[PDB]
Design an enzyme around this catalytic site. Sequence first.
Site, PDB file in Angstrom:
ATOM      1  N   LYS A  44       0.814  -1.228   0.000  1.00  0.00           N
ATOM      2  CA  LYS A  44       0.000   0.000   0.000  1.00  0.00           C
ATOM      3  C   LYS A  44       0.858   1.294   0.000  1.00  0.00           C
ATOM      4  CG  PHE A  85      17.026  -4.780   3.118  1.00  0.00           C
ATOM      5  CD1 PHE A  85      17.906  -5.773   3.001  1.00  0.00           C
ATOM      6  CD2 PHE A  85      17.169  -3.945   4.158  1.00  0.00           C
ATOM      7  CE1 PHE A  85      18.830  -6.008   4.000  1.00  0.00           C
ATOM      8  CE2 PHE A  85      18.062  -4.168   5.152  1.00  0.00           C
ATOM      9  CZ  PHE A  85      18.884  -5.211   5.094  1.00  0.00           C
ATOM     10  CG  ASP A  90      12.127 -10.189   7.934  1.00  0.00           C
ATOM     11  OD1 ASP A  90      13.345 -10.316   8.196  1.00  0.00           O
ATOM     12  OD2 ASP A  90      11.442  -9.268   8.409  1.00  0.00           O
ATOM     13  CG  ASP A  94       9.249 -15.712   8.526  1.00  0.00           C
ATOM     14  OD1 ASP A  94       9.911 -15.895   9.562  1.00  0.00           O
ATOM     15  OD2 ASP A  94       8.610 -14.694   8.196  1.00  0.00           O
ATOM     16  CG  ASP A 161      10.228 -11.732  16.058  1.00  0.00           C
ATOM     17  OD1 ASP A 161       9.460 -12.108  16.997  1.00  0.00           O
ATOM     18  OD2 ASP A 161       9.878 -11.639  14.876  1.00  0.00           O
ATOM     19  CG  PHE A 225       0.571  -0.345  12.572  1.00  0.00           C
ATOM     20  CD1 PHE A 225      -0.463   0.070  11.784  1.00  0.00           C
ATOM     21  CD2 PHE A 225       1.515  -1.158  12.001  1.00  0.00           C
ATOM     22  CE1 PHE A 225      -0.560  -0.301  10.452  1.00  0.00           C
ATOM     23  CE2 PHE A 225       1.399  -1.559  10.671  1.00  0.00           C
ATOM     24  CZ  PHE A 225       0.362  -1.122   9.901  1.00  0.00           C
ATOM     25  CG  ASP A 230       0.379  -8.976  16.875  1.00  0.00           C
ATOM     26  OD1 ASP A 230       0.779  -8.867  15.678  1.00  0.00           O
ATOM     27  OD2 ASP A 230       1.168  -8.942  17.835  1.00  0.00           O
TER      28      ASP A 230
HETATM   29  C1  LIG Z   1       3.349   5.032   8.720  1.00  0.00           C
HETATM   30  C2  LIG Z   1       2.295   4.135   8.411  1.00  0.00           C
HETATM   31  C3  LIG Z   1       2.401   2.743   8.524  1.00  0.00           C
HETATM   32  C4  LIG Z   1       1.306   1.927   8.176  1.00  0.00           C
HETATM   33  C5  LIG Z   1       0.065   2.454   7.715  1.00  0.00           C
HETATM   34  C6  LIG Z   1      -1.046   1.700   7.356  1.00  0.00           C
HETATM   35  C7  LIG Z   1      -1.095   0.430   6.866  1.00  0.00           C
HETATM   36  C8  LIG Z   1      -2.351  -0.088   6.565  1.00  0.00           C
HETATM   37  C9  LIG Z   1      -2.723  -1.315   6.074  1.00  0.00           C
HETATM   38  N1  LIG Z   1      -1.745  -2.207   5.830  1.00  0.00           N
HETATM   39  C10 LIG Z   1      -1.933  -3.692   5.736  1.00  0.00           C
HETATM   40  C11 LIG Z   1      -1.623  -4.130   4.437  1.00  0.00           C
HETATM   41  C12 LIG Z   1      -0.443  -3.678   3.806  1.00  0.00           C
HETATM   42  C13 LIG Z   1      -0.134  -4.110   2.521  1.00  0.00           C
HETATM   43  C14 LIG Z   1      -0.947  -4.950   1.865  1.00  0.00           C
HETATM   44  C15 LIG Z   1      -2.108  -5.386   2.466  1.00  0.00           C
HETATM   45  C16 LIG Z   1      -2.456  -5.011   3.727  1.00  0.00           C
HETATM   46  C17 LIG Z   1      -2.754  -6.249   1.572  1.00  0.00           C
HETATM   47  C18 LIG Z   1      -2.086  -5.855   0.213  1.00  0.00           C
HETATM   48  O1  LIG Z   1      -0.753  -5.428   0.591  1.00  0.00           O
HETATM   49  P1  LIG Z   1      -0.736  -4.488   7.007  1.00  0.00           P
HETATM   50  O2  LIG Z   1       0.716  -3.597   6.852  1.00  0.00           O
HETATM   51  O3  LIG Z   1      -1.294  -4.236   8.571  1.00  0.00           O
HETATM   52  O4  LIG Z   1      -0.651  -6.131   6.719  1.00  0.00           O
HETATM   53  N2  LIG Z   1      -4.015  -1.655   5.822  1.00  0.00           N
HETATM   54  C19 LIG Z   1      -5.034  -0.744   6.074  1.00  0.00           C
HETATM   55  N3  LIG Z   1      -4.659   0.503   6.576  1.00  0.00           N
HETATM   56  C20 LIG Z   1      -3.356   0.799   6.810  1.00  0.00           C
HETATM   57  S1  LIG Z   1      -2.650   2.228   7.406  1.00  0.00           S
HETATM   58  C21 LIG Z   1       0.007   3.854   7.614  1.00  0.00           C
HETATM   59  C22 LIG Z   1       1.089   4.663   7.954  1.00  0.00           C
HETATM   60 CL   LIG Z   2       1.619  -0.097   3.596  1.00  0.00          CL
END
Ligand SMILES: Cc1ccc(-c2cc3c(N[C@@H](c4ccc5c(c4)CCO5)P(=O)(O)O)ncnc3s2)cc1
Ligand SMILES: [Cl-]
Lengths: 336, 336
Positions: A44, A85, A90, A94, A161, A225, A230
């Site tokens: 994302k 990276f 990772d 894993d 970890d 976050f 989790d």
């Molecule tokens: C500095 C900062 C760090 C993380 C985020 C957010 C990540 C995220 C998010 N990411 C999730 C997510 C990230 C990438 C991804 C997916 C989910 C499915 C497709 O690729 P997660 O990283 O928890 O597995 N999903 C919904 N809202 C948000 S807001 C926003 C700001």
């Molecule tokens: Cl993201």
Amino acid sequence: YAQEKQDFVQHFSQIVRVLTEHPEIGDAIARLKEVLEYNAIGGKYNRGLTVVVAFRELVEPRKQDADSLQRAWTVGWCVELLQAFFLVADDIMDSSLTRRGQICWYQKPGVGLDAINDANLLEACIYRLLKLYCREQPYYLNLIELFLQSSYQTEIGQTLDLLTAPQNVDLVRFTEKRYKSIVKYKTAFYSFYLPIAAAMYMAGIDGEKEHANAKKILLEMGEFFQIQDDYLDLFGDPSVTGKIGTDIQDNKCSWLVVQCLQRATPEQYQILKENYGQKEAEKVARVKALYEELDLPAVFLQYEEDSYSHIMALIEQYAAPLPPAVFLGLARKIYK
Amino acid sequence: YAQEKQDFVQHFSQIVRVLTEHPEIGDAIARLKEVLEYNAIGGKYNRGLTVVVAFRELVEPRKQDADSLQRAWTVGWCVELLQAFFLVADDIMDSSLTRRGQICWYQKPGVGLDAINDANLLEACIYRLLKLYCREQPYYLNLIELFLQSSYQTEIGQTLDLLTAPQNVDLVRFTEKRYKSIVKYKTAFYSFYLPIAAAMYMAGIDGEKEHANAKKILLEMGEFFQIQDDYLDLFGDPSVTGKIGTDIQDNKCSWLVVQCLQRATPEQYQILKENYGQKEAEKVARVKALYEELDLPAVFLQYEEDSYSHIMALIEQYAAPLPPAVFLGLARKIYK
Ligand SMILES: Cc1ccc(-c2cc3c(N[C@@H](c4ccc5c(c4)CCO5)P(=O)(O)O)ncnc3s2)cc1
Ligand SMILES: [Cl-]
Ligand SMILES: Cc1ccc(-c2cc3c(N[C@@H](c4ccc5c(c4)CCO5)P(=O)(O)O)ncnc3s2)cc1
Ligand SMILES: [Cl-]
Ligand SMILES: [Cl-]
Ligand SMILES: [Cl-]
């Protein structure tokens, strides 16, 4: 973020053009192109975009010429490459199969453990870009040091970890003091502190005290976050999340299991011990039920509330003299 | 080198003390200590020592206070750590068993692919030390950039190597243009250019032209060094070398096989093809014999001579205004 996402991804093509232009090494450079395209794309982009957005909230708009911005894009992409990276490596450690439901790079035919090099190249591309686009800026060394320090903190978090969960089931290992420590080093520093801090430096905001203040807010956001990931991993609607969770199967030192352990009568401790992390689903189903019976989703909802007051108190206290919106934009993304 | 070797290794204990002194992360730091002790010790330290020796040939002895020297030691150790990082990771990628006849780190019980992180920590320790001991020096950024660039060149060399020899036997891959390119990126830049260049910077010698000149000599030394290792791997007395060579077994893109291929009638090409890189010894014995029948040890001895005139011509031409002894000390170590 929604608008800005588009021009953030248009810039990638250029990040690449630049990283791929001494012709004896053409083949290797071809490989590097593949590695970048496969591994840097498809997430994302929240972290890299955070650099860009914060750069705009922090600079007076008359100091945002097209070159200032081209650097913000690039440095956002540096964050994404750093992440790339870590992830490639990772996944190898894993023994993961997929990442974001696509085949992990090391699992592609004919890549294998060569991905270790590939991961190292990703890391290296960070510092090439910084040189290419920022060598003449007064924040140059500041950014090198920050990316390096963020790598170190992350790697350390990873060690912690790895010690704590050896794929060897040991729940004496899984304490709260320790969970917190892992989150902080392994994910929060790079996910939350890094991108804002990078924008701070790009904006002339280099004071140790300002950075310390931003850090106090940002590491606490990062702790929530991850605790929320989790929680969601097991209880998120899986089409709304995208993820279908394997934490329990994996002996992960998850927030759920930590709380669970503070909240177990011995009859419950040597049940959890007979069940945390088997392939078979009825043993995993059984854990989800122990969590349910202990009202863990409620402990979470209570946690999400408290955490939210706490982050706003922290923003009240430590944002100044950054615009609080730097922090609030992020809070809105995460408490969503 | 012989005298100075001792105080170079006494300093390690201190490199470590410093890297191992936020107590929540104690365990990880314990792990880091192990990783350093196992992987940074036990080689000949030629690269790290080169930093120290060259620093002495380059600085007027009145500018060698105890702190100047403590930095030279440290930066020599930074070179060794860089090497340690590459090796730990290369052993994993190669599926190697031993390194310097000791168990490769990733092969130790309970380490495994965690060594990928461990290797990354090694890399990171370079930049922590540089900050710890050089942040206030005018060459600080110069050294960061040099270590980063040396990592990049090495990694690229590794990619090129990996493409060229996939464990998939293809001898169309194994050309001289290409052999040279691998040596240069993968080993010569870090083994030869890096340590001298680091001393140059520490000494105020930062001109691009001076560095380019030193580079021209040093990369040519590195090309010979590796060609000689290739030759020795098969023909060195193995108690005088220490190594008992597995190149042929491994489809390595060795100097021997490159020359061999320029020197093959088709009857000899689809023999070499039926033999390069089997476990069974009679197929490996057979190759050693094809090399012998083509007077490859003679081609080498001819190569070692020519290479030696060439390096002295290069030193005559490009050493100035470094003392030629900077280069000559190294030439003596390698043509031995
Ligand atoms: C500095 C900062 C760090 C993380 C985020 C957010 C990540 C995220 C998010 N990411 C999730 C997510 C990230 C990438 C991804 C997916 C989910 C499915 C497709 O690729 P997660 O990283 O928890 O597995 N999903 C919904 N809202 C948000 S807001 C926003 C700001
Ligand atoms: Cl993201
Ligand atoms: C800048 C520079 C680079 C390399 C060297 C030398 C390495 C070396 C050397 N090293 C060999 C070697 C290195 C480490 C080691 C052994 C052999 C066995 C125990 O651990 P190699 O690296 O070719 O396998 N042996 C004898 N003389 C020399 S001189 C000297 C200076
Ligand atoms: Cl500009
Ligand atoms: Cl050595
Ligand atoms: Cl001093």
